[PDB]
């Protein structure tokens, strides 16, 4: 799924190489990201995730990990 994810956005990045500043084709992209506002908010907030590693160091139990 994630693999596919890339490809999807990749086509979008293949859709934006030709842009002016306020090109139609790009502001339609913003228009969809805002049409899918919270819906995209979810994917971007999936990327809160190493990263949290230090918090494990805050209350590590037995070096392998475990909390």
């Amino acid at each position: 799924l994630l693999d596919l994810q890339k490809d999807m956005v990749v086509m979008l990045l293949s859709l934006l190489e030709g842009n002016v500043v306020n090109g139609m084709i790009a502001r339609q992209m913003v228009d969809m990201l805002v049409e899918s506002s919270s819906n995209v908010e979810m994917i971007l907030k999936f990327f809160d995730m190493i990263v949290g590693s230090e918090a494990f160091q805050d209350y590590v139990t037995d070096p392998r990990g475990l909390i």
Partner: protein
């Protein structure tokens, strides 16, 4: 607003979100974006690689500044 909502990702990838400008095909200046290996945003920092860039700019500004000034780069 949607991106102020998304700040963390941009903050993480900022170091190695490469970007430049080109006069690409359409004559207008496209601004491409490209991945940079985090090793590439490191190897170009500490060593001779910085001073070599300094030697470079010294060898261009004092010698080039002309039609080669892109090419030599």
């Amino acid at each position: 607003n949607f991106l102020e909502l998304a700040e963390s990702i941009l903050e993480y990838f900022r170091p190695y979100l490469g970007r430049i400008e080109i006069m690409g095909a359409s004559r207008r200046i496209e601004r491409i974006y490209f991945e940079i290996s985090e090793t590439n945003r490191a190897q170009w920092e500490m060593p001779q690689v910085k001073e070599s860039k300094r030697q470079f700019i010294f060898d261009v500004v004092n010698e080039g500044g002309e039609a080669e000034k892109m090419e030599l780069f």
